[PDB]
Amino acid sequence: TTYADFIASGRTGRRNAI
Amino acid sequence: ESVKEFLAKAKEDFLKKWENPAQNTAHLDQFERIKTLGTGSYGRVMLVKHMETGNHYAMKILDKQKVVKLKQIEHTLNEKRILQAVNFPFLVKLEFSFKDNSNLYMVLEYLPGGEMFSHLRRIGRFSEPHARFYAAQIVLTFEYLHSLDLIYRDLKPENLMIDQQGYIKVTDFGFAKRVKGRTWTLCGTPEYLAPEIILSKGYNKAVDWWALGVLIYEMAAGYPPFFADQPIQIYEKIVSGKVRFPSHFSSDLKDLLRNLLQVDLTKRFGNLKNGVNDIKNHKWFATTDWIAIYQRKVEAPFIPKFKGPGDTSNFDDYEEEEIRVSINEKCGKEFSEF
């Protein structure tokens, strides 16, 4: 599922500005 | 009063402050350090207690030398100059600002409810009425900011604080800028960047409307429309011209999102001849009473558990570092107007 893919990704925490 | 009457008075109030900014309105010795609420390359945020009042505040601490290395001098002067000049129910208020030999300080109202980010991740997703309630606040906030020629440039759940009434307040004006023409700075957060920013074009306030599309999608889905493990992979997805919606998204939600997450600037909602009304009058917002939202009369779908004005349970733990103040003034000229 897209949810499972998001949760397994390295970008679920607070995101930094570029 | 009407929207126009309100906005005309809002511009007059903003310009007076924009032209003669408030400076050096407090000192570090008027605050007691409580806990570090956040830390990154852009600086730290510290929970402090103001002794004279007993009020709690979120103190943003910037190291002048680090700001210089990060090429953020003009952006920091923008942030403070804009914050001291604005006044809107859904913006975090700048209570005081000052600087010393080593650091710049911006003392903001503290919302123990924390960031929408933490609640969104834990709960998983917000139902359409819940996401709509927050989205309505952002639409009104951008209508206000854009009327003052301000572009925000960092909309995301991490920058949306939840108050004791369940209403939101936009925080972090690190990339906010007063610009009448187009601008070119590559800034923002990967997941929220409009294609025109990625493609190094001159861009305008339409980037904020694109970011609204990303926010609504993330609130309602529980994950962003374009995600990957690395920023380069995110950019490829954004520019590809393709978006997939969860099957639970309503027909009206998908239609609004196609109009906000629109690559063609001659078609993107918020940008067009009718402006913000293209968004306000969309079928997805048919039940939204724009005035009742502004007047804070709508019952919030969620109120964070209140545990005291200095409670920090909605924030993570961070390494506690010293607030070093050199005996020598650093970057005197660069930050003279702060």
Residue numbers in the entry:
A (entry chain I): 5 to 22
B (entry chain A): 13 to 350
What does the published report state?
In order to generate a more robust crystal system suitable for the generation of high-resolution protein-ligand structural data required to facilitate S6K inhibitor design, we decided to develop a S6K1 chimeric protein based on the catalytic subunit of the closely related AGC kinase PKAα (PKA). Co-crystals of purified PKA-S6K1 chimera with PKA inhibitor peptide (PKI, residues 5-24) were successfully grown, routinely diffracted to between 1.5 and 2.0 Å resolution, and ternary complexes with inhibitors could easily be obtained using soaking experiments.
S6K1 and PKA share a sequence identity of approximately 33% in their kinase domains and their ATP-binding sites are nearly identical. Analogous to PKA and other PKA-based chimeric proteins, the PKA-S6K1 chimera could be expressed in E. coli and the tetra-phosphorylated enzyme purified using a protocol described previously.
